[PDB]
Amino acid sequence: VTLCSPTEDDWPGMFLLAAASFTDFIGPESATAWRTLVPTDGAVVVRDGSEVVGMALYMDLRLTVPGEVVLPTAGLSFVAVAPTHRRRGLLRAMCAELHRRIADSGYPVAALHASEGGIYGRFGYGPATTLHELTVDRRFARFHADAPGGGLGGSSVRLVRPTEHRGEFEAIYERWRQQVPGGLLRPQVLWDELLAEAKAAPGGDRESFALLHPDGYALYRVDRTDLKLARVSELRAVTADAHCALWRALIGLDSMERISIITHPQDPLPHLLTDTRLARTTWRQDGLWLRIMNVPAALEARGYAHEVGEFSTVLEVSDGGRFALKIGDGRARCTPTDAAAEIEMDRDVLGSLYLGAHRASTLAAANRLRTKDSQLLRRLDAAFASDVPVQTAFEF
Amino acid sequence: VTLCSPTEDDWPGMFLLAAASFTDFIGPESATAWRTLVPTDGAVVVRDGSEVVGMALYMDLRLTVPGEVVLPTAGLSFVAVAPTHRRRGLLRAMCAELHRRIADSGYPVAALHASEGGIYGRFGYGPATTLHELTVDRRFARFHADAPGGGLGGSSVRLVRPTEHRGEFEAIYERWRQQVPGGLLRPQVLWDELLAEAKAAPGGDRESFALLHPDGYALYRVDRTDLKLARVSELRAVTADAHCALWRALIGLDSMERISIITHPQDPLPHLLTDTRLARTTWRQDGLWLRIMNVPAALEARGYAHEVGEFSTVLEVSDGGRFALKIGDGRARCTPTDAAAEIEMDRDVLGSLYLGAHRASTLAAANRLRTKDSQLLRRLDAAFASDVPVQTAFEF
Amino acid sequence: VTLCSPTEDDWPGMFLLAAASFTDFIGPESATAWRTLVPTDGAVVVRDGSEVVGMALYMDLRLTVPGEVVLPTAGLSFVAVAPTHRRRGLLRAMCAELHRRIADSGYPVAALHASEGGIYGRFGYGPATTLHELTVDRRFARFHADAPGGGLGGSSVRLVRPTEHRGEFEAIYERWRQQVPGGLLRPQVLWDELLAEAKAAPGGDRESFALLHPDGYALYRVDRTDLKLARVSELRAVTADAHCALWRALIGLDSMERISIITHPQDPLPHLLTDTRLARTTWRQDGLWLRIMNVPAALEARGYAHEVGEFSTVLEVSDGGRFALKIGDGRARCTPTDAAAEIEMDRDVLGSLYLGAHRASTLAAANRLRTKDSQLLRRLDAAFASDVPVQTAFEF
Amino acid sequence: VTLCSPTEDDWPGMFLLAAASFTDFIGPESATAWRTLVPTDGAVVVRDGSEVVGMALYMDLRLTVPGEVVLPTAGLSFVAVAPTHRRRGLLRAMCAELHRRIADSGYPVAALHASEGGIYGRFGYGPATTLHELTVDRRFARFHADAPGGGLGGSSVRLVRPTEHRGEFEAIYERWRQQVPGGLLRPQVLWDELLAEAKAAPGGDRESFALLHPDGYALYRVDRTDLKLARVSELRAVTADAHCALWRALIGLDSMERISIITHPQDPLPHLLTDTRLARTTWRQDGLWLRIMNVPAALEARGYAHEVGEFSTVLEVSDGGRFALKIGDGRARCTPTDAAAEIEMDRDVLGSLYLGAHRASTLAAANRLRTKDSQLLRRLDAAFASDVPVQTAFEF
Ligand SMILES: CN(c1ccc2ccccc2c1)S(=O)(=O)c1ccc2[nH]c(=O)c(=O)[nH]c2c1
Ligand SMILES: CN(c1ccc2ccccc2c1)S(=O)(=O)c1ccc2[nH]c(=O)c(=O)[nH]c2c1
Numbered sequence A, B, C, D: 001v002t003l004c005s006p007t008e009d010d011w012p013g014m015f016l017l018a019a020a021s022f023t024d025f026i027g028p029e030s031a032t033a034w035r036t037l038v039p040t041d042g043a044v045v046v047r048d049g050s051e052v053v054g055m056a057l058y059m060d061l062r063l064t065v066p067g068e069v070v071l072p073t074a075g076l077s078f079v080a081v082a083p084t085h086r087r088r089g090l091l092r093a094m095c096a097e098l099h100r101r102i103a104d105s106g107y108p109v110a111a112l113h114a115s116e117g118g119i120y121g122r123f124g125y126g127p128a129t130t131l132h133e134l135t136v137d138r139r140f141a142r143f144h145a146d147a148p149g150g151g152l153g154g155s156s157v158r159l160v161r162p163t164e165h166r167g168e169f170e171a172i173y174e175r176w177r178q179q180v181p182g183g184l185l186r187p188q189v190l191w192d193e194l195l196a197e198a199k200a201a202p203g204g205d206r207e208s209f210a211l212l213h214p215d216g217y218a219l220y221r222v223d224r225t226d227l228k229l230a231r232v233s234e235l236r237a238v239t240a241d242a243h244c245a246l247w248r249a250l251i252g253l254d255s256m257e258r259i260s261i262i263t264h265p266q267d268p269l270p271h272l273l274t275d276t277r278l279a280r281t282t283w284r285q286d287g288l289w290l291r292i293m294n295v296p297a298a299l300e301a302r303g304y305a306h307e308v309g310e311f312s313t314v315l316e317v318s319d320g321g322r323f324a325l326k327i328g329d330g331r332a333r334c335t336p337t338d339a340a341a342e343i344e345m346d347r348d349v350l351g352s353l354y355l356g357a358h359r360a361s362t363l364a365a366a367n368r369l370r371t372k373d374s375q376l377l378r379r380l381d382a383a384f385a386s387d388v389p390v391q392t393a394f395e396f
């Protein structure tokens, strides 16, 4: 059992392991396209002394963080251990090797989507965004008097074929991702795959349609089996107006009973209706997971709330360093120190605070975050909070 | 159709309407006890010219709000219109009369739990707390290395009969409610009813048990039909230690597959586990609804975040007044003004901001809250936020 | 294995067989009351040579038939063969003995409700009324502009306790049953049992409520398990106004999602709504079964449609006689003849035509009814039709 | 927002709206075929000032009505409003324009199938046929002694491939539709589509088979997911013999548990069995909707029951005219008059009476039909009744 960068000949064996490991495997041709997002020496495989029994790689991503700052980000994916080689520490070995390479390459953070919630905490990843499924019973949905775009004249939203308005979706998304924490640059090969999935599949998914506003879009399809359910695969709106207009159109799907979407906890849709309860939270789960590779670089790179006054403290990350942290004017200064720690946390906890999705208070209550001073807690809470709500861009 | 305060002879007719209107009706003897919480002239009925076709009342409550300040609160309940007298504006008439009496009596706020989410917005009530159901698959639940109370020696939690430790529950709850936004004083007659419901019912609910810590308790029962589900009716913990200890005991219910609880969005339980995902959010709904009766009294009474600096603005409440609002040192000054409004919102929106459960940013995105200045939004967001997470005390 | 009229000592053995045979067995005290409806020598039992292994009886009933004519009717019930004595022809023996006694006593017809649809055809019983379950999704239900009782002022319907308005229900029902084909006199002991069942049962049915109009009533209860379903046990309306008023009140049960009722195929409720489809037919089954004991007496006793002109024919009932049938002025003359048959049918088929619930055309298409002349078919169809729709009074 | 007849260039936009609006959309090539049934100027579209946001058309159909009389009929279909343009009265505008064109073209009636039951009443359409789903548990089904085709020798029914016996199905159907109220001429392009749908679909419907008698056929397929359910898509029988023979063959599908069919309320199948209850009514819904465009032409065109004697009255249709109606010898005379109305009803109600599917008595009980004379009601009931049961030909 050796650990190497894969050669061209290794990939058919990797695709086999992929097919066996992932029920939503996109298949060899799509997989061959996604390869273009993997840097040279961005992949590891494990051979048995030879077929492939383990694999992992990272992609070059650009993650938006609070203060509209864009970080180079190593996005872990295509992780699999053969069912024949469990409990041999192959994952620990592969993750260690990639983290070495990611760190040495100069990525401040790494990110992944977790198949299970129990795996990636021990490797320093913390869940940093939250997915919220809303299901609307649209037959009772009435917009509030206060809701935008409820006037006379025409609608600014059009029903269109996805494939004929790629450029407009690309442009809207590009604006969206640059201004939202959790935003990722979506490269060309992922747009190719998105509009491929919008096509009807013989014995699979139904045809997708688009609702297009100057400052927003929504892609939706009727569900395979539940023919009174419309599934919004993606809604991206840059203005509140666009967001309201798109939801007026979706509630206008008079042949559906229910509209479902995977969104974020601060989605304003409930507040657009006279009955907030009509937008039911059906499902909730961790989205993007974050590992802070370089604590000072990451902490210094993001913006902080201007509201909290200037304050200083000492943060110790377990087996990750100890730093004098000074925050003010929504910027941070983070420098080495041997002064006594005021705040203590594992690396994963930091990942979870970083995009402002979790309150320090809350993690402290679980004792994932230690401090003897509760004024400091309030200050961290306020400083690390994001004024733009954190969202999840896309699974990778 | 007249509107009067009920006489003693009206109550049997009110109980009939109650029985017909509410599937969880506690019944005449329990109802006769709850009457003791209704002040003289706290009830209205509508007779048909004579049986009772409409009723509503309020109870005298004490609501804890941010800054550990306790407000006299009119709690609306026992609201019903006979199915024979719908669409006659009997609710509008009853609500108007009670709001007159509540205001004139000097209550700064009124509160209710809503049967439907579409009714009470138009009468100035906004949803002010959020209920979160967590269901834990306890067969996989492992506590984190960092979680309190995972050491050698004995457990500080005891399994007990609820009826034999009323005093200890009363004392813990009393401490809890005084330090948590959303806390309500629970009077003696409600404790009587809580420990009555802890008893096994022939063909009904099963026997309830208690887990008791010096600084917390939990009441739980196995579900009627799902015999692998334990339902935590109530968990109240004053320290993080107590909260963790109680959850160690509940995960120790080795004959159950799942533990469910109705809690709040900031419950730290997910973070006590190695797999946060094991604590699934199964259900989410509005809890306590709040109507600000006197805007300046209410705004001046609660505390605000010390973190945000001093700032001033002008708030207009629709058909509710316009005020110079000055906030600093976590106190507010709220005085009449005819100066131009900087912030605009209906009375209900204010109710929803008041306990810090909803962000001003979020309501602004839905246009329930208007301002042309986004710096003011951030400032309101931070000021109205509660450092202690807002919770829901009990249904009334 | 002998066949006798039961003595007082036989009844405890009959109650045992009842308990074992009928899951809805009303129990010994209720059963002892219903005994008062059984005439002397109205019961048979079969003993094993001695415990009871078979039983059957009839009750003295009064059945309304078209033309508002009331027939003495033998109502078969309490029929059971022990599971130890199947396929011994005990039912054939008991039915034969009772039919002998019923015929000799001078009943023109006998009637029953069938546990299964495959049993009673061979003993000359045909299904003569049809049960229709309507389930209304009351959240969308809007009454038509044309529907009665949608004006200003007050409602004439009251919500009441069933037990306090027995007299008014008795009176309304008495009017109802005398003017509707399928109507049965409900004796005092059945009213006692109806208002006993309206009471809440520990671990059983919930409390029943009543909607009372001068010319109609409805008894309803919320379902045991589905707490958003109201079950209308009984609705009896003498005028269209009463029927519409009662349905306005039932749709006014704003806490329910669905209202269900067992009614008849010609119930006008669908036509009271703007969306007829909201009143869904969820279930449909044979109601009352009829055996014509004396063909000429029965045919001569009921009224016929005045619309069809005078016509004459010869009807042969298989092993039941052949008759010259002359119909005109909505009366029939039925006399012995040896003239050639024009119409042929088994006795059961006649039962099914008798109250006008089945068309002769339809039974002819199945060849249950033979004739070489289709003009005669049309004439029978029209003559046997009832202008008042046939309904089902109550199970016995 | 303008309203025009579509040009060739409009149709790709209409197909897009179709795809988005109808989950069972037959697709562009099938849709292009059905276009051949639309007359010149039989279609309207609404453009936004330009993509298509509204459309509606009618097809030229031939409807059989009581007395085996065949009426030219405008069949409304392909009706859709974009979800972006709800509540702009686009449907009201389109329906008005088409009704103008239909009336001026000289159609006595128009017809449609309704997606929802709440829409088309206000445009003068009434539901005129009833769909009945019967599900038979064929494992218990035994034919009655009286049922045809239960003798020795061979069976006259053959199992065949649908595509190889098109001619025989066409011929049987042509005979069927000419003798049944609700019958529609099925043009060649609809036969092409029927036998296309009889083919197995990759990941869709299974292969269809046919049972063929000289005077009847049945097309059936096993259900996609429930492999013990056979779905009879279509059964057309011209003689009772054919109908019984076909059902003997279907009950002979020994590998199925249940056979389901969408039929009519007077289907004799229940009466062919020893247990009528085995043929369960699982589902019931409005079929064909009818709008009487020209009251006197329509009323004069159909036949009436010969059984009822000659009678005269005055019918007022709301905003539709007032007529002296004289009925006798199963013909009607309908002429203008200003004499006082004896009968009053909206146009939709007339549609519902026209094919004899609804009794006048029943609509009167709901007050959809007004008269102060109940003898007239009985007379209308009998006159408008159809001796051949009304059926539904096919969805359009
Ligand atoms: C989406 N896919 C990607 C993702 C990144 C890739 C990078 C290079 C080459 C191919 C790539 C394919 S993929 O191959 O279907 C894929 C991958 C990992 C997965 N992990 C899971 O736990 C799961 O449930 N489904 C997964 C699907
Ligand atoms: C809990 N109950 C109270 C509450 C307050 C009371 C005050 C005075 C006298 C009796 C009282 C009884 S109660 O009577 O079962 C009750 C009341 C209102 C309800 N409203 C609802 O929408 C519902 O679903 N269930 C309800 C149950």
Ligand SMILES: CN(c1ccc2ccccc2c1)S(=O)(=O)c1ccc2[nH]c(=O)c(=O)[nH]c2c1
Pocket (backbone or CB within 6 Å): C018, C022, C023, C024, C025, C026, C027, C030, C031, C032, C034, C035, C038, C057, C059, C077, C078, C079, C114, C115, C396
């Ligand atoms: C309703 N009941 C009657 C009916 C008639 C009686 C006459 C004399 C004494 C007692 C009587 C009790 S009863 O005893 O629960 C009863 C009877 C027959 C039944 N047959 C069935 O197939 C069934 O499912 N449930 C039945 C229930």
Ligand SMILES: CN(c1ccc2ccccc2c1)S(=O)(=O)c1ccc2[nH]c(=O)c(=O)[nH]c2c1
Pocket (backbone or CB within 6 Å): D018, D022, D023, D024, D025, D026, D027, D030, D031, D032, D034, D035, D038, D057, D059, D077, D078, D079, D114, D115, D396
């Ligand atoms: C059956 N189809 C027809 C019907 C008539 C047509 C006339 C000209 C051109 C194409 C045509 C297509 S169609 O295009 O799939 C179609 C149409 C309307 C529908 N309305 C509904 O409410 C629904 O649920 N499904 C529908 C399906």
Ligand SMILES: [N+]
Pocket (backbone or CB within 6 Å): A065, A066, A067, A068, A181, A386, A387, A388
């Ligand atoms: N941000």
Ligand SMILES: [N+]
Pocket (backbone or CB within 6 Å): B065, B066, B067, B068, B181, B386, B387, B388
């Ligand atoms: N607080």
Ligand SMILES: [N+]
Pocket (backbone or CB within 6 Å): C065, C066, C067, C068, C181, C386, C387, C388
């Ligand atoms: N009758």
Ligand SMILES: [N+]
Pocket (backbone or CB within 6 Å): D065, D066, D067, D068, D181, D386, D387, D388
């Ligand atoms: N006919």
